[PDB]
Amino acid sequence: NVQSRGLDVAVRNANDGISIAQTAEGAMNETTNILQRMRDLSLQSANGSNSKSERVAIQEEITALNDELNRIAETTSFGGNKLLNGTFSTKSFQIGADNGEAVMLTLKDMRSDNRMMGGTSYVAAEGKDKDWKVQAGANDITFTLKDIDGNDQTITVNAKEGDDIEEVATYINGQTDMVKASVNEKGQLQIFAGNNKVTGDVAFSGGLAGALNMQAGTAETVDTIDVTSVGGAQQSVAVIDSALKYVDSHRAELGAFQNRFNHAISNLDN
Amino acid sequence: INENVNASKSRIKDTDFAKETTALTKSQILSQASSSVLAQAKQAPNAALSLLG
Amino acid sequence: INENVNASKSRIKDTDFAKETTALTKSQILSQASSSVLAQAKQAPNAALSLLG
Amino acid sequence: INENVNASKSRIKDTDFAKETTALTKSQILSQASSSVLAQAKQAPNAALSLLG
Amino acid sequence: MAVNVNTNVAAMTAQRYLTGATNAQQTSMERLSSGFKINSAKDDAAGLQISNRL
Amino acid sequence: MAVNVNTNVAAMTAQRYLTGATNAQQTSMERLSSGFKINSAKDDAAGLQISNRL
């Protein structure tokens, strides 16, 4: 009898956990939609037809959406218990008739200033212009880094001779997915390594890297992206892509949690 | 969030009509069976009365 | 490209209305079948009581 | 201004037909369930009567 | 198992299959109303990710 | 889940997606009436600014 009675409690607790995960995933869905809208706005801002005023307007919209993301993170709750602001840690839902058979669920901070929502930015000190082309013998750029698995990776990209800076950025984007390359107004090559594919600083080597003279890395997040400049919009596109991948990964974790818990409910009923 | 909150609040506050209906029928059958067995057990004193003679 | 990408996303994210309506109808009929089975099942204690006493 | 004011007044004074029809259906099912339970509950005193005497 | 008066295991099986069918029915109604096969990641997580990227 | 009479989540799903579809319908009908895809800054504010300047 104790078992039977406990099995029902376990079913009740499993349903409660499923409800909590569903609420968190709905809030996540909304944050994903807001992030996609912000990505479209930043992509629009990066175009050269806009003057300062259109960039300021897009920045106002992006600030509004950023405040909305922060509000969603800080206000979403399950019966007054906050979920996506980071104060909710791993909680063990008990889905067994006997103690010790609980399953821990962790939900992560969804604020736009979270580390996980951005990455590192490296901006070349030497800017190029329209007539600049890649020279022979100074076309190779090597990124030495390590992914979130810890593996050491060395990506050597040999840019084509005669390429201008934007063709170089496009080539770098095509050759690898570990970093995102873009160009600002001054012709400086910006490189973004999101904190979901790169751990620590990125080392630059080669003739092209020597010619560009990449500077130090600055930590960028969705809370610190601004599109009043071409380079700002280009970099916020990559920042929002990183944030979208992070949020989608958390949504996948919650969905797997819910599927496991539905299977547990069926088994416990049986 | 409101949809999810209502879905959660069901699973704690709302009635599982199937389960409660089954429990109601079980309780009525149990009560009728106890009423009948009490009605029969009321016949013990007349068995004690027939002890005379 | 945009057209091809939209077509790709339809094959993954969009729902198949024919298959979904068929599944919904099947689920509804299964639900009424289980409801009828439960209604007929609730009378087992009734049969036990009507057996005797 | 008149259009926006009418739109605002819709959100406060007008009715949500979908939500209201759902509420009416829920209330009708609840009322019928209470009617059935009352009709079944009125058969407690006669059960006590049929217990004995 | 024999004549039993206070527990109905057959009723329990009927309720379990009824709740399963009810879940399936709600999922079908949600899919039809939304028009999207994937509304939550519990439907298809990798499919949700690839569809969002697309 | 559990046959109940009080909360109808499927109804809330249908209502939410119905209101979304109605909002999309109203937006599309307004755009068709005016002939302008930007009738407010909530559509695309920067586009509104550049189109107004043009």
C-alpha–C-alpha distance, residues A203 and A226, integer Å: 26
The position carrying tokens 């259109």 is A54
Q: Spell out a b/e string for B17-51, using b for 16 or more CB atoms within 10 Å of the CB, else e.
A: ebbebbeebbebbeebbeeeeeeeeeeeeeeeeee
∠ at Cα A162 (A160, A164), nearest 5°? 95
C-alpha–C-alpha distance, residues A46 and A260, integer Å: 43
C-alpha–C-alpha distance, residues C29 and C23, integer Å: 10
Interface chains of chain C (3 or more CB pairs under 8 Å): B, E
Q: Is E35 left (phi over 0), alpha (psi -120 to 50) or beta?
A: left
Q: How far apart are the first and last CA of chain B?
A: 81
Contact of B21 with E14, CB cutoff 8 Å: no
Q: Which residues pair with D28 in a beta bridge?
A: none
DSSP chain A: -HHHHHHHHHHHHHHHHHHHHHHHHHHHHHHHHHHHHHHHHHHHHTSTT--HHHHHHHHHHHHHHHHHHHHHHHH-BSSS-B-TTS----EEEE-SSSTT-EEEE------TTSGGG-EEEEEESS---TT--PPTT--EEEEEEE-TT--EEEEEEEPPTT--HHHHHHHHHHH-SSSEEEE-TT--EEEEEETTT--S--EEESHHHHHHTEEEEEEE-GGG---SSHHHHHHHHHHHHHHHHHHHHHHHHHHHHHHHHHHHHHHHH-
Contact at CB, B3 and A12, closer than 8 angstroms: no
Structure tokens at D31: 């009322």
Q: Which residues contact E38 (CB under 8 A, 6 or more apart)?
A: C12, C13, E44, E47, E48, E51
Instruction: For the beta carbon of residue F2, count every other beta carbon within 10 angstroms.
Output: 17
Nearest by CB to C45, from B21, B25, B36: name it: B25
C-alpha–C-alpha distance, residues D41 and D26, integer Å: 22
- At what resolution in Å was this solved? 2.7
Q: At A152, phi and psi to the nearest 5?
A: -80, 130
Task: Please report how the helices A2-45 and F45-53 are oriented relative to each other, as an axis angle in degrees rounded to 10.
Answer: 20
C-alpha–C-alpha distance, residues C27 and A35, integer Å: 37
Structure tokens at F36: 């302008």
Q: Which residues contact A167 (CB under 8 A, 6 or more apart)?
A: A160
Contact of A199 with A147, CB cutoff 8 Å: yes
Contact of A88 with A179, CB cutoff 8 Å: no
C-alpha–C-alpha distance, residues F15 and C43, integer Å: 38
CA dihedral sign of residues B39, B45, B51, B53:
negative
Structure tokens at A120: 């590192």
Contact of E36 with C14, CB cutoff 8 Å: yes
The DSSP letter of residue E36 is B
C-alpha–C-alpha distance, residues A257 and A93, integer Å: 11
Contact of A231 with A183, CB cutoff 8 Å: yes
Chain E residue nearest residue C2, CA to CA: E54
The DSSP letter of residue D35 is H
* A29 in reach of chain B (CB within 8 A): no
Best interface-test mutation with F: which of B2, B5, B9, B15 has the largest number of F CBs within 10 A? Answer: B15
∠ at Cα D48 (D43, D53), nearest 5°? 130
Structure tokens at A119: 């990455």
Interface chains of chain F (3 or more CB pairs under 8 Å): A, B, D, E
A31: closest CA among A71, A61, A58, A78? A71
The CB-side HSE value for C6 (13 A sphere, CA atoms) comes to 3
Chain D residue nearest residue B29, CA to CA: D47
Contact of A214 with A123, CB cutoff 8 Å: yes
A62: closest CA among A78, A75, A45? A45
Residue F42 host element (H or E)? none
Instruction: For the beta carbon of residue F12, count every other beta carbon within 10 angstroms.
Output: 18
C-alpha–C-alpha distance, residues A87 and A82, integer Å: 7
Q: Which residues pair with A214 in a beta bridge?
A: A124
CA dihedral sign of residues E48, A23, A67, A179:
negative
Q: Which residues contact A239 (CB under 8 A, 6 or more apart)?
A: A117, A118, A119, A192, A194, A220, A221, A222, A225
Residue A234 Cα to chain centre, angstroms: 15
Helices (H), strands (E): how many in chain B?
Answer: 3, 0
Chains D and A touch (3+ CB pairs under 8 A): no
Long-range contacts of C38-44 (CB under 8 A, 24+ apart): C38/B18, C38/B22, C38/E11, C38/E14, C38/E15, C38/E18, C41/E8, C41/E10, C41/E11, C41/E14, C42/B21, C42/B22, C42/B25, C42/E8, C42/E11, C44/E4, C44/E8, C44/E10, C44/E11
Q: Which residues pair with A105 in a beta bridge?
A: A91
C-alpha–C-alpha distance, residues A67 and A34, integer Å: 11
Q: Which residues contact A253 (CB under 8 A, 6 or more apart)?
A: none
Residue count of chain C: 53
* A256 in reach of chain E (CB within 8 A): yes
Contact of A42 with A236, CB cutoff 8 Å: yes
The DSSP letter of residue E44 is -
Rg, C-alpha atoms of chain F: 18
Instruction: For the beta carbon of residue E47, count every other beta carbon within 10 angstroms.
Output: 15
C-alpha–C-alpha distance, residues A180 and A170, integer Å: 9
Question: If interface means Cβ-Cβ distance under 8 Å, which residues of chain B face chain E?
Answer: 18-19, 22, 26, 29-30, 33
Structure tokens at B35: 């009423």
Q: Which residues pair with A181 in a beta bridge?
A: A191
C-alpha–C-alpha distance, residues A199 and A219, integer Å: 12
DSSP C5-48: HHHHHHHHHB--HHHHHHHHHHHHHHHHHHHHHHHHHTTHHHHH
Q: Which residues pair with A124 in a beta bridge?
A: A214
A103: closest CA among A228, A269, A258? A258
Structure tokens at A266: 């069926």
Q: Which residues contact A3 (CB under 8 A, 6 or more apart)?
A: A97, A98
Experimental determination technique? cryo-EM
* B12 in reach of chain A (CB within 8 A): yes
C-alpha–C-alpha distance, residues A138 and A159, integer Å: 9
Residue D21 host element (H or E)? helix D17-41
Q: What are the chain E neighbours of C13 within 8 Å (beta carbons)? A: 36-38, 47-48, 51, 54
Contact of A266 with A255, CB cutoff 8 Å: no
Contact of A255 with A25, CB cutoff 8 Å: yes
Instruction: For the beta carbon of residue A270, count every other beta carbon within 10 angstroms.
Output: 8
Q: Using CB atoms within 10 A of its CB, is residue A246 exposed (0-12), middle (13-18) or buried (19+)?
A: buried
